[PDB]
Design a protein around this ligand. Structure first.
Ligand SMILES: O=C(O)Cc1ccc(O)c([N+](=O)[O-])c1
Lengths: 211, 215
């Protein structure tokens, strides 16, 4: 019954000093919340880093340290390394429940940023025959691996029927993701233009389909 | 050497229950508490509850009180968690994590998590649909929609087109999965020379090949 907030994503470069924060919705984070820091690396790999606000888990590099900065818990990576690129969650204790934040995707640039390559394919012909039409929006080669996909059917944000894959690491260390917009053989015919909009590290690419 | 072992995947029908396991090795089972966590791919971690393998005492998340049951078997060093009345919605990955309660207060070691899939669906083969453009290089793709279980294998021109091929992860939609694959080919090769995506779905001994015809 408390809500833990963390920054969504942050980007740094090897050698830098970065600070992730953890806010509680009910007040200051104190040493009674026993703030915990956990790291999720690709392949569903969890490691605990900090426990009790500031105790560094054993075998955790000394570049990781925990503390309280004002009313929040904070994790500072002093001299970030490329291996530090992962998702960091914080957890706070509330007398008898643990509440985990939403995670902070940390990117530690081990290569230049890269703009996505967006592709939109309309419903195939043999599909409308199922009286179903799926619009596919393909997004690859982007880095940092965090994008925002927005569909636009006839000019109005589409806030339903859209499913987006979580970015997966390609072999080049860039990411790919795919968004599907599922309609009815019907809905398809009723509308005019479809748009897949991808926002990536401040720039937007819009792939438009003109039925 | 501390380790927490969990099975990789479980498949149960909606309405049943599952007993997930977490077998500890490498430390004194009883000196640490054991916790269970739920992860919905891409929505965050949710604490379920914790158990003291010493006394068998638990603390639950009020939200899971009637869904989860923690138990421990001291002799075999395994913590277990039962989940009842499962529904499609319980599908997620469930991790077990050790908590140094008596020490420094961290969830130090974690299990690799167990992926539970609750589906009423039978072995079903994908329906492959060609993904041709509509307007230097050109991208093609193919949709492998509504199949079950996982996985499907996608190849382009039986393997010749092995470079610049992207096969996306699948999304479980109404008990059936969906996947996509695209290949980038010189704009010269296409549509001159044909491109076929070869989808293979083992569970259902299926082999589908679809030529991507311009249109
Ligand atoms: O480590 C601490 O002091 C915090 C704490 C206190 C009581 C608990 O029951 C607990 N837990 O995880 O179940 C954790």
């Amino acid at each position: 019954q408390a809500v833990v907030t963390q920054e969504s994503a942050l980007t740094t470069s090897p050698g830098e000093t970065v600070t992730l924060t953890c806010r509680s919705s009910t007040g200051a984070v104190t040493t009674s919340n026993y703030a915990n820091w956990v790291q999720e690396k690709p392949d569903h790999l969890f490691t605990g880093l900090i426990g009790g606000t500031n105790n560094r888990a054993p075998g955790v590099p000394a570049r990781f340290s925990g503390s309280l900065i004002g009313d929040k818990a904070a994790l500072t990576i002093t001299g970030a390394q490329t291996e530090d690129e992962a998702i960091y969650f914080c957890a706070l204790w509330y007398s008898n429940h643990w509440v985990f934040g939403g995670g902070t995707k940390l990117t530690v640039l081990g290569q230049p940023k890269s703009s996505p390559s967006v592709t939109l394919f309309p419903p195939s012909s043999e599909e409308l025959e199922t009286n179903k039409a799926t619009l596919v929006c393909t997004i690859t080669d982007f880095y940092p691996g965090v994008v925002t996909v927005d569909w636009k059917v006839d000019g109005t944000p589409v806030t339903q029927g859209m499913e987006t894959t979580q970015p997966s690491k390609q072999s080049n260390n860039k990411y790919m993701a795919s968004s599907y917009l599922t309609l009815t053989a019907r809905a398809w015919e009723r509308h005019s233009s479809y748009s897949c909009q991808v926002t990536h590290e401040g720039h937007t690419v819009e792939k438009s389909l003109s039925r | 050497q501390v380790q927490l072992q969990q099975p990789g995947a479980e498949l149960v029908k909606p309405g049943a229950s599952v007993k997930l396991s977490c077998k500890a090795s490498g430390y004194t089972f009883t000196s640490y508490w054991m916790h269970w966590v739920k992860q919905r791919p891409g929505r965050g971690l949710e604490w379920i509850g914790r158990i003291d393998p010493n006394s068998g005492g638990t603390k639950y998340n009020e939200k899971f009180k009637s869904k989860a049951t923690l138990t421990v078997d001291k002799p075999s060093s395994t913590a277990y968690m039962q989940l009842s009345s499962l529904t499609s919605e319980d599908s997620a990955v469930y991790y077990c994590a050790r908590y140094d309660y008596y020490g420094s207060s961290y969830f130090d070691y974690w299990g690799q998590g167990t992926t539970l899939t609750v589906s009423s669906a039978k072995t079903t083969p994908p329906s492959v649909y060609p993904l041709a453009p509509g307007s230097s290089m050109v991208t093609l793709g193919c949709l492998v929609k509504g199949y079950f279980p996982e996985p499907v294998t996608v190849t382009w021109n039986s393997g010749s087109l092995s470079s610049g091929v992207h096969t996306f992860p699948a999304v479980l939609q109404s008990d059936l999965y969906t996947l996509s694959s695209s290949v980038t080919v010189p704009s010269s090769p296409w549509p001159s020379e044909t491109v076929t995506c070869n989808v293979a779905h083992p569970a259902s001994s299926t082999k589908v090949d679809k030529k991507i015809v311009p249109r």
